Amino acid sequence: TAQKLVFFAEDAXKXY
Amino acid sequence: TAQKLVFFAEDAXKXY
Amino acid sequence: TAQKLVFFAEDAXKXY
Amino acid sequence: TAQKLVFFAEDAXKXY
Ligand code: NA
Ligand code: NA
Ligand code: NA
Ligand code: NA
């Protein structure tokens, strides 16, 4: 929205 | 550590 | 653009 | 390996 955020997580289990 | 996690954030302000 | 692509590279040297 | 590279791509089709 620049402001940005992303994430990714795996254990097998993700967002401008 | 597979289990994995990463993130990135920007507003301008990031982690197996 | 949904279709999304992001990348991050560090050696210390990142794109809906 | 620190040097780090990650990428994520979605169209719906991801690498220290
Ligand atoms: Na948006
Ligand atoms: Na480790
Ligand atoms: Na866009
Ligand atoms: Na390694």
**The pair of three-digit structure tokens given for residue A9, joined into one six-digit string:** 């997580």
**CA-only gyration radius of chain C, Å:** 11
Experimental method: X-ray
Exposed, middle or buried, B14 (CB in 10 Å: 0-12/13-18/19+)?
A: exposed
Asked if D2 and C12 count as a contact pair (C-beta separation under 8 A), the reply is no
Angle at B7 between CA A12 and CA A10, to 5 degrees: 5
**In this structure, is the dihedral angle defined by the CA atoms of residues A7, C9, C3 and A3, taken in order, positive or negative?**
positive
**Measured in whole angstroms, how far is the alpha carbon of residue D6 from the centre of its chain?**
3
**The pair of three-digit structure tokens given for residue B3, joined into one six-digit string:** 């289990």
Closest-CA distance of chain C to residue B11, Å: 15
C9 CB neighbour count, 10 Å cutoff: 14
**The pair of three-digit structure tokens given for residue C6, joined into one six-digit string:** 């992001």
Distance B8 CA to ligand 1 centre (A): 16
Among residues A1, B8, A11, C1, the alpha carbon closest in space to that of D10 is found at C1
Distance D5 CA to ligand 3 centre (A): 23
